[PDB]
């Protein structure tokens, strides 16, 4: 089976749980739940959001 990758998050997406959010621009935005979209819709940055793999890439700790 094929699972996609999230926009803010990076883990695979399992159908049967999800939601979808779209902004005014018409761009597609995919995540996993309201907690996986809350700070995204609240204009936050994944470079400062510590607890994802984006901060790892922005602090070179791989």
């Amino acid at each position: 089976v094929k699972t996609e990758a999230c926009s803010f998050s990076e883990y695979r997406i399992y159908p049967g749980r999800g939601q979808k959010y779209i902004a005014r621009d018409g761009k597609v935005y995919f995540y996993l739940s309201s907690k996986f979209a809350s700070l995204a819709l609240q204009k936050k940055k994944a470079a400062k959001l510590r607890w994802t793999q984006t901060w790892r890439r922005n602090n070179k700790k791989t």
């Binding site: 089976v1 883990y11 399992y14 159908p15 049967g16 739940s33 907690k35």
Partner: protein
């Protein structure tokens, strides 16, 4: 005079009185019917609160907008700590109802079952079923001959074994399960081989059939009308509170009718859920049982993080449509359907795509702890 604006009554009168159930198990009023043409097999099963989850599927109903496209569904995966068959009951029809002729017990009875006959087992002499299990086989042959000659309904006394479950309770739950089939003279042989052992499901439980669930709902104690029957709240200006029914009856009849919603017990009710179609057959130990050839990963019925307020599941699994009433650790009774159907979904062949394995407690992030370890590698 008439109401200005009509609206349907609050709650259903078919579930009255809304009082506490007298027992904890889910008792069955009626078993599925039997027919002359049909061949002799089993009738029902039982277990504990097992899990009602999703499973990914695909419609094939001609003319839907999903059809070929993937769908997500909802069904249940059921639990079977193997029930032990210990007794046989014969019932015969009379104008006063269906009446017991006799019950015959197995030559050897377990201790979990014996514990149910006591309120203080720890302090007792454990004398139950001590001199009634050493009767000669002659009485058995002398009365089982009467069973077929006079009785029309046969039931098997079976009991659960909570020791295979994380339950604190040690007494077994006891029930009787009917046996169905056609003509009486074909039952004498078929009711003579499986009279002691435990219960493997796969003999009768098969894909593409319907079954029902019966249990006791959760308890909530005494609750008001607003929660018991969902009546309209009164406006905030109300003098002596707003969480009540304003008019509990007209002047005449000069009494309160039984149809008026009132405060009282809600929950801990006895309920049966219908129209649940069974879909898949599985086991407890086997490794390729729940997932499919499209996913070919490694995981099974096994849970993750521990089942909140239950524990860990170490018994069999199947697949059945629906979701289930009652609280965690509650005994659930599984009956078959009373009459099968022949419609589109009735004859529709069923097959899944993917099965969840995650931390069903709360919002966790990892499904298999193997991937949990691997994706993180060298940690503290």
């Amino acid at each position: 005079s008439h109401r200005k604006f009509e609206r349907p009554r609050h709650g259903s009168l078919g579930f009255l009185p809304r009082k506490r159930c007298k027992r904890l198990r889910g008792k069955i009023r009626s078993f599925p019917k039997d027919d002359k043409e049909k061949p002799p097999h089993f009738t029902a099963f039982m277990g504990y609160k097992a899990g009602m989850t999703h499973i990914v599927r695909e419609v094939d109903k001609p003319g839907s907008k999903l059809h070929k496209k993937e769908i997500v569904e909802a069904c249940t995966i059921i639990e079977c700590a193997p029930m032990v068959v210990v007794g046989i009951v014969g019932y015969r029809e009379t104008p006063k109802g269906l009446r017991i002729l006799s019950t015959v017990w197995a030559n050897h009875v377990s201790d979990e079952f014996r514990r149910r006959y006591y309120k203080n087992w720890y302090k007792s002499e454990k004398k139950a079923f001590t001199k009634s299990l050493n009767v000669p086989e002659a009485t058995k042959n002398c009365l089982l001959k009467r069973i077929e000659k006079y009785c029309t309904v046969l039931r098997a006394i079976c009991h659960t074994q909570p020791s295979k479950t994380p339950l604190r309770m040690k007494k077994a739950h006891i029930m009787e399960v009917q046996i169905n089939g056609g003509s009486m003279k074909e039952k004498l042989e078929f009711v003579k081989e499986m009279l002691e052992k435990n219960l493997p499901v796969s003999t009768v439980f098969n894909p593409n059939e319907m079954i029902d669930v019966i249990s006791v709902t959760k308890g909530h104690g005494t609750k008001g009308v607003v929660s018991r029957y969902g009546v309209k709240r009164l406006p905030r200006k109300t003098h002596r509170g707003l969480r009540k029914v304003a008019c509990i009856g007209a002047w005449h009849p000069a009494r309160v009718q039984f149809q008026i919603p009132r405060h009282g017990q809600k929950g801990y009710f006895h309920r049966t859920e219908r129209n649940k179609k069974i879909y898949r057959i599985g086991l407890k130990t086997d490794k390729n049982s729940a997932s499919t050839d499209a996913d070919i990963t490694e995981k099974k019925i096994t849970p993750m993080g521990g089942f909140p307020h239950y524990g860990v599941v170490n018994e069999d699994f199947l697949l059945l449509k629906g979701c289930v009433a009652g609280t965690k650790k509650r005994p659930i009774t599984l009956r078959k359907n009373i009459v099968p159907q022949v419609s589109r979904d009735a004859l529709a062949q069923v097959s899944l795509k993917f099965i969840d394995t995650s931390s069903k407690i709360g919002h966790g992030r990892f499904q298999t702890s193997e991937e949990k370890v691997k994706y993180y590698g060298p940690l503290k």
